[PDB]
């Protein structure tokens, strides 16, 4: 028999109007084990292999808030991985596997598994449709806007066929003025609508809920302070440096996955930001820098 | 059933007199799966669990050299993990599982496995003797002075018992003047006698053969260039910076894991080096910083 | 029926077998109020407009806000036309109304939500039905829909001599084509019920003014028009096409 | 069969539990462990050390009564293990309490939201609603921790971690109960139930002679001051022996109060006191026993005994 | 049951540093039977069908060199067909099926086969990952600099499902100034980074080891002679002609399929080369043009 | 499928069970010619572009213009995606 793995997926933040996978597109919750959002602990095993096959899948929304904040969390599975995110509130019952209850009460949803071996995404494939097992979509619509409602767990029995040299679990992203985040050599901790640069400032929203390690490489002309807040606190040893036209810093912070209308990591005060290069690693608290 | 895992352990560098782990101490090849020298890929899987159990264990040293160089390579398995090095030649064949042949010709060695569950190395043990499954020692003792001779692979069927969150992909090591490497919360990826500092210079010997990401945080007074030595090469993007009394650099380099009498990463030219702090991540040929 | 309406385009007759309404609360026993659920056999009556009419309609459940309801509607055996190529007397076509009256709250809070169950069966098939509205407004008039379906309804839009507004309350993601007979240019903003997928490309030219917007509405009330065109002069006709398109059918700068 | 199943849930109001003892014989044994103090940001074992709850019978936090019977034996098992969080609050206060068991006894604690859910064996419900966690047992015999070992991983059975976040700040939210059937194999004479802990400048606590009342992240020394954060909740008996150059005063902080006849004395380079205090184990950001006002503190040596309110000295 | 098919794949040219398909990209050895590098004879049978199924797959690298040259040759089978190259040494043995020995000594490697039917490559795919059966990679990494070391054979039992008309024996490739090779309706037989043009010259590197028939159609302004380089030799009948702005040649040459730092077919001496169009046919020692 | 394409929008997977092609003539035995009906297992090949490729594709019926044809296509059991996005 296999081994179950309970894994944290989201911290569900409620909404008033209508909202999909909360701040993000219909790209986040792909059913591949090469996805840090749905698989925070199996992505390290998924870097060693190229074929997977799912056996048991349950979603387990567990509430956290007091029973005073009305809401409706829905959990939806697609067989596609390229269908668009749902548009209305009432385009929810038209899916195949769906559980939609109130915010304050726990749920469950079982997903029937196939028997086909599928590729583990270390790419840059064009068709995600034939690779993934499907999407997971999470919808909130009543109210109780800025409140951590609950959190969604996920249980798996994943087996892997033929191995591989390890896919490098360190991102590498580049921003230009007017550009977006563009990943390089994987994985997908950051999605492209997660950052912004100006002529003087810089910011990153991080919602995967881990403890990470940055290496800022920012091309500016003056120095700038680096503040960490909103979703994440410093494991406070953030040592930066200046020199030539580069700006180099290294940060250890612990995000919490919750949305906020403040960037998690923010760089301000400088002038003429042109490029920002990143590396994120998912480290632990012992990887700080002694003053 | 299981899945085998062929993994690179060393690249054997021959020596005239007598040498046990081609220079490194009797600490390198502990048979825990939390040991990146022995498990460059399984340590990512093993960072999620607390108990393990080995099922199949084989060597297979494989040569790389022409049949012109005399020499002798031996492979050794202690059941202890705290015995000392094999000081003489008569001690080499006296171990429980030992195979010793010439340099130019291949070998194999099987280790009989137990059925007990042992803990995975987490941040501190003192009696390794009860946690590890044993050592591996690799003696070379006649004249094939330091030419690359061959390399040693290792096969496993490893199963793990109850899970855990991820522990540490990243090291933190700190050097003071006169002191040595002291790691804090990571794997290893370095070990103490593999770095040296002076009043003005700095060096790292990396013999693990991966592709890494450093963050040099060096308390200096003046700037200093960073070269990449004979063991390893850059990917030509070593963006660094100065600022306050710190010196901050971030390098992506790939090492062959071979002995050389040059530091693999060297930092010289400055003055009054007092502390050096590190973070090593094992990236890929991605995360380099675009100019 | 945001999903069955596409399958309803391929058929002509329908029944309705099982009908339950299953209001689920989302609130503690702290907030007062009342929610009532009403089914009419007419499909063209008005709504209360009193407390007198809420209780005894014919078939109504009117419990409190914090407590669950359940209403069942008895069915028939008749076959009725699916509404295509819009009729006027839509009383012999529809099966009835739902009315959903609340009062004496607990003001604008997510109190609960209403679920609806159906077993719908369809008799003989069509080729399709054109799922794109065509609605026209004149000065002083209202919306008059052509070509079907019923995204917008006649008390949803207003025109002036210089401005224009739509209150889209269906909660999807849509695709407009404004064709407005003006004399000057103007701007189009997206109000409270909805947001852009922000590359709405428009153009002026002759007496027409042609835009093409992609917005995502939520259906919640707001006292701003969800799509507003203002700043022009001498608006006389506004013609529409709405399509329910996803977030990839936007134009590109 | 209509493909959508409506199920109704009636969340009533405050749920509580009522606990009686019988007790009968000359063995399940329920005990309190903590009172769960909710916090806003993120917190482990609620301000206590990173190592505190630790499955030996020679552990004062989990077994304040069995630790005396554990001194007379060497081996132990643990048969039945349940954790039975009982709420004390209505459905009005938000928050989350999680209960975690490690198979290690030397890991650290989260330090994230990521690590709370999937540890291996964890129950993570809300504050106002009851939990129940069971731990599967083994059949091995392990040493009772006497004459303190270093690698206490092969000795203990594991940890308990008790993580709360996103409260409901510092309110008596609930409390955690613990059940055991402990059996003991071959007996000792006794074990010395008096700690001996030593601090140097820059160092931490290093315990000798056992048991584990104080743990190394509980004390701090300076050149002139000294402080202890006793978080075990008993009534104790100290003997401060502090190597100073001047005299000083000893006050009793927030976690504890005197039985107010603490007699101390100065003399040679030593400074010797003897205090009887009663601690509560709740957090407070004051040292529970504080010695300040002196100069050149180098060593502080301790003896702690768990004595009742009659072992105080008399003016 | 079937009929085995021993087929020449490469001729291994050793290199000092690290090299993956002796220079050519990670596109060459796709395991479709529409791949003339891996199937120099079965591609004619495979041009009649749409589905295929591999049954037996073996290597057998065979050396050609004296036992005086040190070196190491490795043979690799990805199950992916879109993974990147093995950047370092530790990645070599970490594949699913991998055998690595010295240069002077023979090997073998068996690949376990599936039972699925996959499409044969017809003129365009983007996700090769679902069409091919995998890659083959051939790493050499120590010092036997570029001497012919050995050659690698390949064995198959291939069965095909439902037929089709013949597709393409002949390539059409077009080069513009600054551009690269872009093939139109053929096999390959060339691949892009194997030709170079200047304002006055032209060259082709052919590493497939067959006997071909070219038709050079080069838009020139002046004439130019055509030589046949170091990889390949003429059969001495290279009749060419000039006329209008086109230059038309037709050559029959036989290539050994070995690396050389000379273009195998070179066209120089003219001026203002703008387009070069090709057609390659794999003739025999017949079709040369009698003077 | 000008009618099923609307019902195909409401689903993701499909099969095809029975496939017949049933060319019906509308002309006497006076007009010469040839009509062939071809099924590929590919969906991205090109078309002939010769007389050579018409006859032996894999599964083809190639009678005259004035005379009736009938071609059947064997099915599979696999589920395939409806082409969306
Ligand atoms: Ca791969
Ligand atoms: Ca009426
Ligand atoms: Ca552990
Ligand atoms: Ca085809």
Swiss-Prot record, chain C:
Keyword RNA-binding in record: yes
Region of interest (S domain, virion shell), ranges: 1-122
P domain, projecting: annotated span: 123-253
Cell compartments where the protein resides: Virion
Annotated keywords: Capsid protein, RNA-binding, T=3 icosahedral capsid protein, Virion
Entry annotated with the keyword RNA-binding: yes
Superkingdom of origin organism: Viruses
Location, primary (coarse class): virion
One GO cellular component term: T=3 icosahedral viral capsid
UniProt-recorded Gene Ontology molecular function terms: RNA binding; structural molecule activity
Family: Belongs to the icosahedral plant coat protein family.
Domain note: The N-terminal R domain is rich in basic residues and is essential for RNA-binding and virion assembly functions.
Complex formation: Homomultimer.
Functional description taken from the UniProt entry: Capsid protein self-assembles to form an icosahedral capsid with a T=3 symmetry, about 31-34 nm in diameter, and consisting of 180 capsid proteins. Plays an essential role in virion formation by interacting, via its N-terminal region, with the bipartite viral RNA genome and specifically with the 3' terminus of RNA-1 and the TA element on RNA-2. Also participates in symptom development, viral RNA accumulation and systemic movement within the host.
Protein name as catalogued: Capsid protein
Species whose genome carries this gene: Red clover necrotic mosaic virus (RCNMV)
Shown stretch of the complete protein: 86 to 338 of 339
From Swiss-Prot, chain F:
Record family assignment: Belongs to the icosahedral plant coat protein family.
Organism: Red clover necrotic mosaic virus
Location within or outside the cell: Virion
UniProt-recorded name of the protein: Capsid protein
Parent sequence residues shown: 86 to 170 of 339
Function: Capsid protein self-assembles to form an icosahedral capsid with a T=3 symmetry, about 31-34 nm in diameter, and consisting of 180 capsid proteins. Plays an essential role in virion formation by interacting, via its N-terminal region, with the bipartite viral RNA genome and specifically with the 3' terminus of RNA-1 and the TA element on RNA-2. Also participates in symptom development, viral RNA accumulation and systemic movement within the host.
Description of how the protein assembles with itself and partners: Homomultimer.
UniProt comment concerning the protein's domains: The N-terminal R domain is rich in basic residues and is essential for RNA-binding and virion assembly functions.
């Amino acid at each position: 028999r296999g081994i179950l793995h309970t894994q944290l997926v989201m911290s569900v933040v409620g909404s008033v109007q209508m909202r999909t996978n909360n701040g993000k597109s219909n790209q986040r919750f792909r059913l591949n084990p090469s996805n840090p959002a749905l698989f925070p602990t199996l992505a390290y095993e998924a870097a060693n292999y190229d074929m997977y096959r799912l056996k048991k899948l349950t979603l387990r929304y567990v509430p956290l808030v007091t029973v005073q904040n009305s809401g409706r969390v829905a959990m939806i599975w697609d067989p596609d991985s390229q269908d668009s995110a749902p548009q209305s509130r009432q385009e929810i019952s038209a899916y195949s596997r769906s559980v939609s209850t109130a915010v304050y009460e726990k749920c469950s949803l079982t997903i029937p598994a196939d028997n086909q071996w599928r590729f583990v995404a270390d790419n840059t494939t064009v068709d995600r449709k034939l690779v993934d097992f499907g999407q997971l979509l999470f919808v909130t619509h009543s109210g109780s806007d800025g409140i951590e409602t609950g959190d969604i767990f996920l249980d798996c029995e994943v087996e892997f066929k033929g191995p591989q040299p390890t896919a490098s679990i360190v991102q590498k992203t580049v921003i230009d003025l007017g550009g977006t985040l563009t990943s390089f050599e994987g994985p997908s901790y950051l999605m492209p609508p997660d950052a912004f640069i100006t002529s003087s400032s810089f910011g990153l929203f991080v919602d995967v809920a881990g403890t990470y390690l940055l290496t800022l490489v920012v091309t500016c002309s003056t120095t700038g302070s680096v503040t960490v807040g909103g979703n994440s606190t410093l494991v406070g040893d953030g040592r930066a440096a200046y020199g030539s036209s580069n700006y180099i810093a290294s940060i250890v912070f612990t995000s919490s996955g919750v949305l906020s209308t403040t960037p998690s990591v923010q760089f301000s005060g400088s002038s003429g930001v042109s490029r920002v290069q990143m590396n994120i690693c998912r480290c632990k608290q012992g990887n700080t820098f002694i003053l």
